[PDB]
Scaffold this active site. Structure first.
Site, PDB file in Angstrom:
ATOM      1  N   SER A 166       0.911  -1.303  -0.179  1.00  0.00           N
ATOM      2  CA  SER A 166       0.031   0.088  -0.148  1.00  0.00           C
ATOM      3  C   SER A 166       0.842   1.193  -0.008  1.00  0.00           C
ATOM      4  CB  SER A 166      -0.938  -0.099   1.218  1.00  0.00           C
ATOM      5  OG  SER A 166      -0.170   0.358   2.544  1.00  0.00           O
ATOM      6  N   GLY A 167       0.415   2.430  -0.483  1.00  0.00           N
ATOM      7  CA  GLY A 167       1.082   3.665  -0.630  1.00  0.00           C
ATOM      8  C   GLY A 167       0.220   4.870  -0.021  1.00  0.00           C
ATOM      9  N   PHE A 184      -1.977   6.443  -1.855  1.00  0.00           N
ATOM     10  CA  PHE A 184      -3.351   6.844  -2.591  1.00  0.00           C
ATOM     11  C   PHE A 184      -4.180   5.497  -2.495  1.00  0.00           C
ATOM     12  CE2 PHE A 184      -0.349   9.893  -4.419  1.00  0.00           C
ATOM     13  CZ  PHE A 184      -1.051  11.252  -4.172  1.00  0.00           C
ATOM     14  N   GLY A 185      -3.426   4.370  -2.449  1.00  0.00           N
ATOM     15  CA  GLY A 185      -4.505   3.315  -2.221  1.00  0.00           C
ATOM     16  C   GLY A 185      -3.453   1.798  -1.957  1.00  0.00           C
ATOM     17  N   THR A 186      -4.335   0.878  -2.356  1.00  0.00           N
ATOM     18  CA  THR A 186      -3.679  -0.717  -1.999  1.00  0.00           C
ATOM     19  C   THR A 186      -3.630  -1.496  -3.206  1.00  0.00           C
ATOM     20  OG1 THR A 186      -4.636  -0.529   0.375  1.00  0.00           O
ATOM     21  CG2 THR A 186      -4.212  -2.831  -0.583  1.00  0.00           C
ATOM     22  N   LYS A 221      -4.932  -2.069  -8.260  1.00  0.00           N
ATOM     23  CA  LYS A 221      -5.041  -0.916  -7.145  1.00  0.00           C
ATOM     24  C   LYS A 221      -6.408  -0.341  -6.935  1.00  0.00           C
ATOM     25  CE  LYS A 221      -1.587   2.238  -6.779  1.00  0.00           C
ATOM     26  NZ  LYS A 221      -0.419   3.127  -6.887  1.00  0.00           N
ATOM     27  N   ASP A 265       5.436  11.660  -8.363  1.00  0.00           N
ATOM     28  CA  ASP A 265       5.729  10.874  -7.119  1.00  0.00           C
ATOM     29  C   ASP A 265       6.773   9.885  -7.862  1.00  0.00           C
ATOM     30  OD1 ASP A 265       5.763   9.534  -4.802  1.00  0.00           O
ATOM     31  OD2 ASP A 265       3.805   8.193  -5.285  1.00  0.00           O
ATOM     32  N   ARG A 277      10.582   3.115  -5.872  1.00  0.00           N
ATOM     33  CA  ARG A 277       9.044   2.222  -5.516  1.00  0.00           C
ATOM     34  C   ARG A 277       8.040   2.464  -6.486  1.00  0.00           C
ATOM     35  NH1 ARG A 277       9.115   6.779  -2.144  1.00  0.00           N
ATOM     36  NH2 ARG A 277       7.451   8.089  -2.745  1.00  0.00           N
ATOM     37  N   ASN A 278       8.477   3.405  -7.478  1.00  0.00           N
ATOM     38  CA  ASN A 278       7.464   3.591  -8.546  1.00  0.00           C
ATOM     39  C   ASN A 278       8.139   3.226  -9.752  1.00  0.00           C
ATOM     40  OD1 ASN A 278       5.136   3.979  -7.319  1.00  0.00           O
ATOM     41  ND2 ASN A 278       5.099   6.032  -7.160  1.00  0.00           N
ATOM     42  N   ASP A 304       2.737   4.419 -11.715  1.00  0.00           N
ATOM     43  CA  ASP A 304       1.948   5.355 -11.022  1.00  0.00           C
ATOM     44  C   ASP A 304       2.247   7.121 -11.356  1.00  0.00           C
ATOM     45  OD1 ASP A 304       0.609   3.484  -9.450  1.00  0.00           O
ATOM     46  OD2 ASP A 304       2.161   3.405  -7.895  1.00  0.00           O
TER      47      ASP A 304
END
Ligand code: ANP
Ligand code: ANP
Ligand code: 57N
Ligand code: MG
Ligand code: MG
Lengths: 300, 302
Positions: B20-21, B23-25, B45, B137, B141-142, B155
């Protein structure tokens, strides 16, 4: 000369069998997992294990074929990916979650539209035409040897290396295999589709097939085929190999037919069956089919 | 148009949580096409906060943009499902994000992989710039691993669709929530830093509230032990206060490409000789199994 970089030599430690998918004359197909050296991921593959264990010197001849089969490059043909030379040889290629076309059309009887059926005929002819251009003979074309990448995209497999009821008469009688006997088997393959996966010459002993063929008897017109489609099939099963159509012509004829599909196949509720919208077609490709391919022949 | 598939809850199913981050899961998922019996792995997501019917028109406008992004080094949105929640569907990447990958192969990654990752990320960011899109962002991780040879930014825009990544953000983003291609470049520098340190946490144990003052004092992330001075110089230039003084993604493609051509001149890595780009044989295999996508040839050493 085949570029040998296209054939990966696998170690027995790199992969595991996890399920049987089926079997045929030459071996047993498994769904397997490839675990790349040093990584955490398990990548699904298809594995064929050959029926008989082989000597190192027999393995040489298997390796030469393998280099050739790893070297094909056409959107409607599968290529060999790798090989493992254990006591009995294992062969690796891409796994098709939709399975072979035979099973696909049986699971979707009679709910396949004319557009799909005729387009599959084009793709299989393109694939075969490519094999002819590379001077490869299939020898075992059948619906079980056409694989479904996505429902809009089929690919020929298992070429280049008996199934009496798919074989041309000269093959039955003389074990002669040519591009034109491949054309005969193309005909039978088309028959399998048009009947949604019925068994050719069902109930008739393989023993008698050559006799029946000499009497001029043939697979019956499937009930969804108009006379022009049937005529094509019959031309594939002419005694004289040179009178049969060439794959090049078969591409053209079926492409024409795909442009006006309800004129050439009669299917109840064809109006209502799915013809793949651009949205659906793009989703499938982005998800599981990113390779470069041709445009499918759509109805004018 | 035809690029964004609208799905129904019946044709997909969430299995496992991947993470999760803000804005969501994210879920490992399955797409079960109507009338088929196959289960195709996808990633889903689900956003954190439920949707209005009016906030749906907003989400979809943006989703359509995200689905239009077509580039080998950027992920596109494949599909969407709008219920009480908003669920977004994209290709599942079994290898996971680049951040995780560099941590797990820590000290066993060669300079050729690292520098080429910098090239690829720079290409994907440059594409978004040409399309006039801001990521907002960017971080390791992205960036996702399609294969170890092929990475892809994920993302983008999701930050426009709606906890704050202060330690990846340009100073003008912290202070004024200004986001530009040049603020993306700041985050790109941080991202490169994450890779060169094999996944260290930037400004670790320094309060986020202290970051803007640290930056104003001229202080920055330290030189990773494997980076030569030219590589550290590029990163520091990405973190200039004056945005127009930072490099352009276009330039970053050129610089890191230059460096990928002579990778041991620019990174100093113990054991780097026994680590190399894959043979064509090994690369062919990977692509046939995982990556049929067209993509520029990976820069090899001279
Ligand atoms: N790459 C593949 N991906 C998914 N399923 C496959 C694949 N290859 C084969 N199969 C399935 O496994 C079954 C057996 O394959 P195979 O061992 O080649 O025998 P066959 O072609 O069906 N009959 P034969 O002509 O005698 O070889 C096929 O029919 C398919 O249903
Ligand atoms: N397509 C994908 N395939 C496989 N894993 C993914 C995918 N997208 C995201 N992940 C992983 O899912 C988890 C959550 O991702 P996400 O919800 O976007 O938060 P985050 O990117 O880690 N931080 P942030 O998005 O900046 O708030 C992470 O572990 C990702 O590595
Ligand atoms: O591997 C194949 N089929 C598979 N099904 C599941 C996994 S593998 C098939 C094939 C021929 C042409 C193209 C692709 C595969 N082969 C190769 C090959 C090389 C040497 C000796 C025999 C064979 C053989 O049968
Ligand atoms: Mg077969
Ligand atoms: Mg994320």
């Amino acid at each position: 000369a085949p570029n040998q970089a296209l054939l990966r030599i696998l170690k027995e430690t790199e992969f595991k069998k996890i399920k049987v998918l089926g079997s045929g004359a030459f071996g047993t197909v498994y769904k397997g997992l490839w675990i790349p050296e040093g990584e955490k991921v398990k990548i699904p593959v298809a594995i064929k294990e050959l029926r008989e264990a082989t000597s190192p010197k027999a393995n040489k001849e298997i390796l030469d074929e393998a280099y050739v089969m790893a070297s094909v490059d056409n959107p409607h043909v599968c290529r060999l990916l790798g090989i493992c030379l254990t006591s009995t040889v294992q062969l690796i290629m891409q796994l098709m979650p939709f399975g072979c076309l035979l099973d696909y059309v049986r699971e979707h009887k009679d709910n396949i539209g004319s557009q799909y059926l005729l387009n599959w005929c084009v793709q299989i002819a393109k694939g075969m035409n490519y094999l002819e251009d590379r001077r490869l003979v299939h020898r075992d074309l059948a619906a079980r040897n056409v694989l479904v990448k996505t429902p809009q995209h089929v690919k020929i497999t298992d070429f280049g290396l008996v199934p009496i009821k798919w074989m041309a008469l000269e093959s039955i009688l003389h074990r002669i295999y040519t591009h034109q006997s491949d054309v005969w088997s193309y005909g039978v393959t088309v028959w399998e589709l048009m009947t949604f996966g019925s068994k050719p010459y069902d109930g008739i002993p393989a023993s008698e097939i050559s006799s029946i063929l000499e009497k001029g008897e043939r697979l019956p017109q499937p009930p969804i085929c108009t006379i022009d489609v049937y005529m094509i099939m019959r031309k594939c099963w002419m005694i004289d190999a040179d009178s049969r159509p060439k794959f090049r012509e078969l591409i053209i004829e079926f492409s024409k037919m795909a442009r006006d599909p309800q004129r050439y196949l009669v299917i109840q509720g064809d109006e209502r069956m799915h013809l793949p919208s651009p949205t659906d077609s793009n989703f499938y490709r982005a998800l599981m089919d990113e390779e470069d391919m041709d445009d499918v022949v759509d109805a004018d």
